[PDB]
């Protein structure tokens, strides 16, 4: 084993040396001679009441009008953003939920949690009700995130240090993705849906291939857990937020870190991260009950969003970029514009 | 508002009505989380998730066990945590003490109380009357400890068993009171595998927890 360990150390050294000959400038100095942004003041336009417990997840729909929300009281609600009407209310077999998703076509929703199953609910059907379509079993730990690729494929992350792809009609795993050392906490898909990234508790993020099943790159700069992750709209960068009280921006073509977003007053964690339609603003939610708007090209704060009485747990931006949605542990949701 | 929009509003109102009814039903029940280790006798106390329901004096209870730095945040609004320890395997007491310290100082659990259950006391009596194993070979400070003078209750047992019991009680309680700021308390108890009076202790302790909660809101304490 001594020979193998020595080879591994040499290879890590070679990687670190090659990712230094490829760094000649910095994003800070490439973007010095441009005019800044200004002050972004946003005001609450809606407040959506109805839950009686903590809120853990939310997801927008592709029509930019409908959204779904998950709560610890054991219920899922489909809202209408423009009028604050309730469209559906789905009872759950378990009350320990940590994720939810909304299909691109609009026919299905998904949810899962501390019971090791991902459930798919059929929304529009005869008989008028909403009923279960499929239950997927096979993970050996709690589910943390799920995203739809199409109407018959889904990607899940779990706390057993693994990720899987499923075929819904048959109900079976197709590819297993392995390699992390700790729990996986979030994942995000690319616009073309041929890659995705996952962030874990070993202070690393990995970039995967969907068809082949392999792992192409690994990024390591943080110093504690990674809770949120998201692509740039381009498809060639992503942002990660940690319990270290920092966010970072990574590149896939140069294979290293370009920018860090920190300030000496923040000492809390980061729970959620999102971008804007242009890729110029970065939204991040904190444990200190409020949310911050960052400039993604100069590492400067552009504004705050202060309206919640408890922890901020989820975040989201509409496809057309007209609104942002936040949910909190104080059982409310808000839309800003 | 058009005709269809008014109909949509009426449907939304009915959804709200059912939500409120379900919430009022759920307000009555009390929730508990059961932690412990293997060989703790954890599954024989109240004689993914394994749930359990029972009631005493017309009050409902709901008990969970999971079979942890991450999912422990979900259990942030429960009434109590029930911690169970075997008090006969001296080789594995220090693991239990460290585990208790970790679960006592957690960030998300700064206002949740703990009900201890030092289980399997008949085996402890046998092993302390046998003489073939020494408690002081594992904790040296047992040589220089004496029972509190005027606070020694017992039902008719030996003095040596009383010393052995009180030492372990002290170890856990003095982890508890080192740094807690008076915002949450620890309630210790002794039980075997045949004790049937275990659903009443939880009821009394929960009544005390709710008394403290009521006092804090009205600024009395």
């Amino acid at each position, epitope marked *: 084993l001594d020979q193998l360990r020595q080879e591994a150390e040499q290879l890590k050294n070679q990687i670190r040396d090659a990712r230094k000959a490829c760094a000649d400038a910095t994003l800070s100095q490439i973007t010095n001679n441009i005019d800044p942004v200004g002050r972004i003041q946003m005001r609450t336009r809606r407040t959506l009441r109805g839950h009686l417990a903590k809120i853990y997840a939310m997801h927008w729909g592709t029509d930019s*009008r*409908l959204l779904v929300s998950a709560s610890q009281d054991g219920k899922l609600i489909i809202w*209408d953003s423009y009028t604050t*009407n309730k*469209v559906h209310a789905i009872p759950l077999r378990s009350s320990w939920v940590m994720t939810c998703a909304y299909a691109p076509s609009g026919n299905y929703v998904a949810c899962g949690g501390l019971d090791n199953i991902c459930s798919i609910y059929n929304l529009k059907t*005869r*008989e*008028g*009700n909403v009923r279960v379509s499929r239950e997927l079993a096979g993970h050996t730990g709690y589910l943390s995130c799920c995203r739809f690729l199409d109407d018959n494929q889904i990607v899940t992350s779990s706390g057993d240090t693994t990720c899987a792809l499923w075929d819904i009609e048959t109900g079976q795993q197709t590819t297993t993705f392995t390699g992390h050392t700790g729990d996986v906490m979030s994942l995000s898909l690319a616009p073309d849906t041929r890659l995705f990234v996952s962030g874990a508790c070993d202070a690393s993020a990995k970039l995967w291939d969907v068809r082949e099943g392999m792992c192409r790159q690994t990024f390591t700069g943080h110093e504690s857990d990674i809770n949120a992750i998201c692509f740039f709209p381009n498809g060639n960068a992503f942002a990660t937020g940690s319990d270290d009280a920092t966010c970072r921006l990574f590149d896939l073509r140069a294979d290293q870190e370009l920018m860090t977003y920190s300030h000496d007053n923040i000492i809390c964690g980061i729970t959620s991260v999102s971008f804007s339609k242009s890729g110029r603003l970065l939204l991040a939610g904190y444990d200190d009950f409020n949310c911050n708007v960052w400039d993604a090209l100069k590492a400067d704060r552009a504004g705050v969003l202060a309206g919640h009485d408890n922890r901020v747990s989820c975040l989201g931006v509409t496809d057309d970029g007209m609104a942002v949605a936040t949910g909190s542990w104080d059982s409310f949701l808000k839309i800003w514009n | 508002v*058009s*005709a*269809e*929009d008014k*109909a*949509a509003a*009426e*449907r939304s109102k*009915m959804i709200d009505k059912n939500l409120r009814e379900d919430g009022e039903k759920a307000r009555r029940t009390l929730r508990l989380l059961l932690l412990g280790a293997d060989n703790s006798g954890k599954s024989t106390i109240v004689k993914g998730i394994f749930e359990t329901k029972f009631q005493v004096d017309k009050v409902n209870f709901h008990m969970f066990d999971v079979g942890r730095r991450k999912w422990i945040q979900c259990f942030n609004d429960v009434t109590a945590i029930i911690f169970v320890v075997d008090s006969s395997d001296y080789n594995r007491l220090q693991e239990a003490l460290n585990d208790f310290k970790s679960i006592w100082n957690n960030r998300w659990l700064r206002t949740i109380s703990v009900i201890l259950f030092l289980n399997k006391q008949d085996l402890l009596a046998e092993k302390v009357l046998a003489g073939k194993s020494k408690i002081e070979d594992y904790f040296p400070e047992f040589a220089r400890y004496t029972t509190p003078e005027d606070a020694t209750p017992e039902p008719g047992e030996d003095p040596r068993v009383t010393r052995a019991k009180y030492f372990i009680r002290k170890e856990f309680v003095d982890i508890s009171t080192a740094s807690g700021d008076g915002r949450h308390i620890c309630y210790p108890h002794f039980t075997c595998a045949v004790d049937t009076e275990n659903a009443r202790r939880i009821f009394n302790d929960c009544k005390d927890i709710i008394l403290q909660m009521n006092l804090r809101e009205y600024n009395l304490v």
Partner: single-chain antibody
Framework: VQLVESGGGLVQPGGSRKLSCSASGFAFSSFGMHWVRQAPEKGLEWVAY????????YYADTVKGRFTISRDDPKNTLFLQMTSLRSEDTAMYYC??????????????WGQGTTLTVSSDIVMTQATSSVPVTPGESVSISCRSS???????????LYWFLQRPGQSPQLLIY???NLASGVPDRFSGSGSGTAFTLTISRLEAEDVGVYYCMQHLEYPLTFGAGTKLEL
């Protein structure tokens, strides 16, 4: 899904009768239910409405004070009670289900009917009354309204129905552009305010009958007169 209706028969003038409709196959308690009648040779006219939760009721002005609507959710039944029957009430009666939320498709299912023989408003017209067609062609049908059907929120409330010989009508287009479930993709519809058209491509047998257009902007609900296609 099913809806079966009973009652009917001869009734002397001035008498009384009760019509009942029994459901089986769907979640009845979350649907709002209508009554629609058809004369011996005329078009379709609306009668009443009961809401989910029984919180709203509406009546046509021709039957107010004589007819009453009710529902019994646990046994899944709908009722209509006659009083002071006249000679203009000879018709065949239908029961219709409708559900209202964002993106819904009201007026989905129409039951069969029962016969009963006894011994302002938005007027909207279908000028064409008979068109002869041959298979493999394309045909267009028009009806226009009295006032505009385009609300502020952006929806044009207009509906299209089809009634084949000796059957009960079915839904094709809801809100002037959308296509119902089970309907082949050769039907289409478009228009502006106060003008509407339906286009059929590759016309076939089993696509002949009478076509109706309805408005759903404000009560009462108002139907057209009927364009029919002949071989």
């Amino acid at each position: 899904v099913q809806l079966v209706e009973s009652g009917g028969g001869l009734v002397q003038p001035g008498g009384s009768r009760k019509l009942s409709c029994s459901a089986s196959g769907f979640a009845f308690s979350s649907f709002g239910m209508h009554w629609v009648r058809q004369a011996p040779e005329k078009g379709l006219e609306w009668v009443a409405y009961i809401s989910s939760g029984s919180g709203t009721i509406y009546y046509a002005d021709t039957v107010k004070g004589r007819f009453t609507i009710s529902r019994d959710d646990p046994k899944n039944t709908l009722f209509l009670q006659m009083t002071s029957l006249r000679s203009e009430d000879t018709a065949m009666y239908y029961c219709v289900r409708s559900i209202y939320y964002y993106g819904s498709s009201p007026f989905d299912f129409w039951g069969q009917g029962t016969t009963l023989t006894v011994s302002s408003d938005i007027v909207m017209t279908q000028a064409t009354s008979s068109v002869p067609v041959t298979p493999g062609e394309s045909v267009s049908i028009s009806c226009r309204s009295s006032k505009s059907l385009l609300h502020s929120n952006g929806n044009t409330y207009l509906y299209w129905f089809l009634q084949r010989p000796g059957q009960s009508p079915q839904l094709l287009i809801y809100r002037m552009s959308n296509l119902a479930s089970g309907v082949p993709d050769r039907f289409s519809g478009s228009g502006s305010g106060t003008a509407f058209t339906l286009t059929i491509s590759r016309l076939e047998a089993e696509d002949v009958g009478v076509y109706y257009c309805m408005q759903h902007l404000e009560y009462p609900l108002t139907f057209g007169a009927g364009t029919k296609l002949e071989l």
